[model samples]
Target chain A: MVLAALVLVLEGEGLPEPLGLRGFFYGLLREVAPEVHDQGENPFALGFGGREGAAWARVSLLVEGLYARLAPRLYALEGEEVRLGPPFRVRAVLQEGHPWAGVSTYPRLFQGPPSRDLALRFASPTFFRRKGVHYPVPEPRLVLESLLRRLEAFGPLKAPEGVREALLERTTVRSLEGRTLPARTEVDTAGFVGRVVYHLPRATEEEALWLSALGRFAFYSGVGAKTSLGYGRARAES
Target chain B: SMVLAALVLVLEGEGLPEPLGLRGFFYGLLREVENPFALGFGGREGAAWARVSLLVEGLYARLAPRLYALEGEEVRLGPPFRVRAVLQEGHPWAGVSTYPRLFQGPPSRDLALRFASPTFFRRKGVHYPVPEPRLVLESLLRRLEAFGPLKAPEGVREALLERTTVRSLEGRTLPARTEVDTAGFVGRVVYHLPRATEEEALWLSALGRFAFYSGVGAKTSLGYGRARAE
Candidate 1:
């Protein structure tokens, strides 16, 4: 599966210690992709640029191994506020291969491949929200089912109706970190983040193709709620 | 969803009265045979469950199946052009309505047709009263998607849009110029579309196959955009 990747490098006295990584990264996505945000919630999936243990004086760029891409355009005064005393320099580059680039919501850029095995790493917390309640879905069938429904509605994959049950039955969680990272999107919103790897035996070409499509979509759109706030940003490793 | 589900309807009557009110008569008949509120026909998503057409040809503007109203008249519009309405598989009690309106196919190897009624098309809220190959192909594709098995391929929409061209057009306005209750522009548009590629031709035939059974465009129930293959 083809995935769009964006990279950035920042160096300075450090970032504004007041605004934590969550706030800072969210602000960055809003600046570059407000149009996506305007369309709906969790428009793009984001990852901590890297996990390389890094540092700054008091303001650590890689907080627990997660670096963020800073926004270039900011309020002149706030720009000064986002960084410490000395002006911080940030270099950012966004990849062009993303499917959601120019096509304004249509069925044009739609296709898929059913994969035998797929792996993913939740670079950020990944979870689910249902009936105004956010929760973790560990079951492979449920997880894949949710992803299938998402791509069918928003993405280009038009896998037929009914059949998620059988496909889910054939799928097995090959291996998993099963690591849970519980976190809050806002002061009130709370959910868990984790990773799971699964394998499907003799799945139909369409089913595997659609599942792969959802993985690619998960990158920008994020897996679940508060994605706008960096809650479910994941880097698909398949 | 192909040819098996199509039916041809013909209406005969004495000289139709001036101010035919074909659309009104068409709806009244629908109320009698179907339901009072069939396919909202307004902002609401009307049940396209069935596609109807305006009576045309030797029948002309006044031609249509007549409806007996509480107000007056037992008059019926004569069958000028034997009209054809395509019904999707499950439209409740499908048989109902006749009349044409301003304009409105499926894929084909290469397809050709002449609009027998005044037809106009709508795309993303804009109207194209003139017969455009792109809009025509899209209109048919959209309908076919509901019933057909596969999603229409991208190449098909483009190939038909580019290769298709209008061969002839006959413009005619209905609801007349003076009474603008809801004026409709009718036309006889002819097109020449060649099946350039296999995939492209397949959908072109798919789309063309739909046009044969259903009326294209708005007010199809009230009689506007109706046509047949040349």
Candidate 2:
């Protein structure tokens, strides 16, 4: 169960091309965690999901539990925030309830680490806008930068006009790092890829950039995290 | 200031792996400090984080003022504490956070904060079997065998040869020479003096570790891990 969760977080959702733990973790992350929209809709949120299965109930229950653990850790945070407890997961097992759908329960992951604690930072729920483009912005540099800006000056950052402007202006600020950032993000496409980078920040070896992209804009601008697999692909960046 | 930080970013449809005993809480602690401080620095409210002891949480608090380049009195964090702090004479950050410290043994190593989930890896996306801290320690030490005695940075010129203790998780006690976590040099140090070049070197070196901070520091790939699909 723990390994399954590890696999899901490290790797996003997808059927790995190479086939192995990488592929397994990747495939599991994609199946269990629903990040991308199917034709633009999530079955989990719909409850009925247009089709049917017990997975939704299980997921909904897990999320409720997660929300409980997630709330307090944040202490007294305000404004839009992202999920805490754990990344989304959707394995193919037990059989998904799409009756009209093909597969039954998809991938399966264990519950949160016990008491259910959220690992959140500052983040508005992020979405994607492809329109007709491939992926609006896929590069880590671009995504990371956008995320940083979102925290400081995006939509609801409560920072002073001065500090917000300083962060947004680029050249105005001396230090080139974002102060507030959502703790987590699409791990290289929700759950298609699994590696160490998706799981441990202390083990991370990258510097951060600012993300000023606004809510709707950031959402639309932030697409193209995946190459293939999903109903659609990542949106364009430039 | 102690730094509090998250371990990983999990996309929905992603899984959170094991040894979760600490990651979630660690990020939670740091997240708390970041949310408020990101608003502005100083003020008694933000300073309240001064009490946080975890590596990441504490660093975030201490580093806040440094981020703005506004240094005055170096804040003091009392006890079980083995160090002090000062602005790096004239630079923002030198090669590393501080001179490394090798401990006589692993300290109690309690939860600086509560950690629950596993964090995303820096280089690789995530790992399966989410190598437990124990396995990770073994993996890291084994990997370290490839390197000779890591020399201290002339930048700080202060180095401590340390050892890990076998921790009695149940008893909450640390046994001697019983290895624990994997740590490289700079075992521990601080911004003591202010050296422009050294600080830059330290900063670059750190960025290099993260594949950022180009020039002397940019390393666009993950090197310090095992389990390479191999």
Candidate 3:
């Protein structure tokens, strides 16, 4: 039921690549919980961004067990220097004020008011892999399915039946303003970075409530593929 | 010299005439006179109209007189209809120009097009209705190279595919009936070339304008792919 988001403020001279941050964070997690690396769906999401001299990495733990296993180690490194591209001192681990730091529970998210209309902002390049091809469009089905999978895997309660089917059949993209950009990966890949408004006019009352919960969860779960590598940083616009 | 002329024909028909029906009627007229051209059809406020674009001065000379004669004359498109008027001006889709004039436009980084009819592209033996930036530009570039008097500069296709980005898209897919059933998109898509050079920008602008007369994508001759630069 617990979800935790922590922002690690790193004072450094160079901005680290997202891929580099992924390796560094996983390397740290392997010491305490090596099994997390091989989970079917990772119980966490990672995001890294900032300019030179002031960088941040957002780590979100979607399950209580994962937070209890890794939180102490993360806080113990408050004054340590971690090498991600170059040496960076951990200025502090923040849990508030920043957009990427927060604390919530599965029940809190599910009990929130229902909304038929939602807007999602993809702050970083986001894309999905379908049939081995990169699908860069932020289609409603793909975005919602991505979040639903995470919620099912880590949430305290399973979604009601037919929620996924309702999402597929009822969600419609009202408007989209996006452009393709190269993803920071080994191969030459591109994804979309922009905002899209989705409407679920035909969704039933229960369907709308669950869909709204997933939209709010997108802030912590991110959206689409490679979110663990900081590629699909997203937030549900209020 | 190659000339381009768009003739707007207002029609008074019984029932609503589909785009394909108008194309068949126009092609029948062209076959009688042995001419090659492109056609599109649509209407507003219960007034149906057909557009004809002639790429050669000789075709225009041969066809303009006959088209003008159709004014106040009966034409067959499914049911009997009269040519209410033959207008060559006073409409956004009616005008006369040359190939050089179409190509000689100011450089622009943004090109917006409105697909007034169902538009689709043939990709790997399938009809792709989504107007991907590369496919849309490639379709137009292929037509321009085959019909225009000038050749596009080297690396233009690569530049277009790599640099062109779809800034905004508003559309949906619907089934369009021809010889076989296929789906295509009808709506507006704005494309931007963020890193295009001055020369490249000018060439893209020209192609955008050319879309007004050439139509776009597949089956322009059968009254599909009706588009206009906005």
CAPRI band for model 2: incorrect
Tell me the deviation in Å of residue A126 in model 3: 0.3
Worst 10 residues of 1 chain B by lDDT: B34-43
Q: Candidate 3 chain B — worst ten consecutive residues by lDDT sum?
A: B165-174
The 10 consecutive residues of candidate 2 chain A with the worst lDDT sum are: A1-10
Please report the TM-score between candidate 3 and the true structure.
0.60
Please give the C-alpha DockQ score of model 3: 0.07
Screening candidate 3 with a backbone cut-off below 3 angstroms (N, C-alpha, C), the clashing residue pairs are none
lDDT of 1: 0.43
Q: In candidate 1, what are the lDDT values of residues A1-238, reduced to their tens digit? A: 1223343233554332323544554455565445544554332333333323221211111111112332223222232334322344443233333322211222322354457666766655555554443444334554666556555544534556544654566565444443344453343333334455666656677667656655655554456655444456554575
TM-score of chain A of each: 0.59, 0.22, 0.95
Docking class of 3: incorrect
Q: If you superpose only chain B onto the true chain B, what TM-score does each candidate give?
A: 0.52, 0.20, 0.92
Residue-level lDDT of model 3, residues A1-238, one tens digit each, is: 8899899899878776777778888988778879988987988989877777678888889989889987888898899998765778888988898878888999888885788878888888887875454566676778998998889888877776687777765676555555667785835466777777777766777787887898889989998888888888888886
Instruction: Mark the regions of model 1 whose C-alpha exceeds 4 Å error after superposition.
Output: A1-5, A13-41, A49-88, A96-113, A162-172, A184-194, B1-230
Candidates, ranked, DockQ: 3, 2, 1
Segments of candidate 2 deviating more than 4 angstroms = A1-141, A144-213, A218-224, A227-238, B1-230
